[PDB]
Structures are given as C-alpha cells and as structure tokens.
Amino acid sequence: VKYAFKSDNLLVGKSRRDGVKASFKNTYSTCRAIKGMGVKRAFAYLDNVLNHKEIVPFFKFYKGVGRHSQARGSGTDKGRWPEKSVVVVKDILKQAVSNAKHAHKKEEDELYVISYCVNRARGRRRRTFRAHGRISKYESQPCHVELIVGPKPL
C-alpha cells in the first residue's frame, strides 16, 4: 500500500512490510512502544523483550492482558512480551536505518524513531467444527507495518 507519513523537508529512512503473518494488536503495541526512541536504545529494548527483561505496555488492546511488576513507571499496569511481533519489527527497523545511513551518511547516534503506522490486512480463512452439526470461522488478523527514522523531533 502507500505511505501514511507525508513530510517533505526532512531526510528520512523508510521501510515497510505488507501483509505480515503476525497478530495486529500485538504488533501495534510493539511499534508504539518504540516511538520517539533513539535507534541505539530501541535496538537494546527490543532484545530485552525477547529475554523478558522489559515489557511492552498495552494502551489500546488490553482486556485480558495481565498486570505485571515490570510495568511500574509507564502510565499503565498492563503489558506482555510479544515474541513474534518483536521478530518482525526488528527486521523492519534495520532496513530503515540502513536506508538512511546509506542514502545520507548519517550515524546511528543521530537517528530516532519518529513515525509508525500499523493497519489491518486481509486474513487467512479456515474453519472449526462446533457441536450439533455446526461450522464456524477460524481466521487470522494480520497487519501492514511501516516505520520512519530521522532526526530528533522538535
């Protein structure tokens, strides 16, 4: 699809992935948790989620997400450690930093995460069997993911 970020007087690095086989709600929260970070920080932070040293806070899709001790100062008490969404976002981040560090020779020490947009895509459609002869749906909820890197926001 097309890009949702339209700025025209910044030097940016961009990458996207269309139709990602990962939960939409999990992946939205992972991208919103790294917004505004410098790209050194977000790369460490994402490796810590993999190792259960930090959490992803959940501000939008949280009914049934458990409260945990690792989320004390964030604004909420709820979070999780989505391992498959962190695998996707890390690889999309590296393309955008490569795209920027190669089009204009800017270091990772002045790059920041300044935009994101997650959108709902069209899923795989299977079926499950219910009692008394009935059939029901069993679908996936995939996503489109985009991520922009550039200079410190102000």
Partner RNA sequence: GAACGCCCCGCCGGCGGAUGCCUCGGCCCGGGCGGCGACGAAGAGCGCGGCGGAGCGCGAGACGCGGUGCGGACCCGCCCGCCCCGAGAAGCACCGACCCUCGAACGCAGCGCGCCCGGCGCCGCCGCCUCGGCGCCC
Q: How far is the CB of 29 from RNA (least distance, A)?
A: 11
Q: How many residues touch RNA (CB under 7 A)?
A: 16
Maximum alpha-carbon separation in the chain: 65
- Bridge partner residues of 17 (DSSP): 145
Taking CB within 5 to 8 Å according to partner kind, which of Mg ion, RNA, none is near residue 125? none
Among 2, 72, 134, 137, binds RNA (CB under 7 A): 2
Q: Which helix (H) or strand (E) holds 24?
A: helix 24-32
Q: Which stretch binds RNA (CB under 7 A): 44-52, 64-72, 99-107, 112-120?
A: 112-120
The annotation status of 129 as a binding-site residue, yes or no, is yes
Task: State yes or no: residue 129 binds Mg ion (CB under 5 A).
Answer: yes
Q: Does 136 bind Mg ion (CB under 5 A)?
A: no
Q: Which does 75 bind (CB under 5 to 8 A by kind): Mg ion, RNA, none?
A: RNA
Written as six digits, the tokens of 113 are: 């995460």
d(CA 55, CA 60): 15
Q: Restricting to residues 25-64, which ones interact with RNA according to CB under 7 A?
A: 59-60
130, 136 contact by CB (below 8 A): yes
Q: Is 42 exposed, middle or buried (0-12, 13-18, 19+ CB in 10 A)?
A: buried
Report the C-alpha gap between 20 and 88 in whole angstroms.
Answer: 8
Minimum CB distance to RNA, residue 59 (Å): 4
Binding site for RNA (CB under 7 A): 1-6, 59-60, 75-76, 117, 119-122, 144
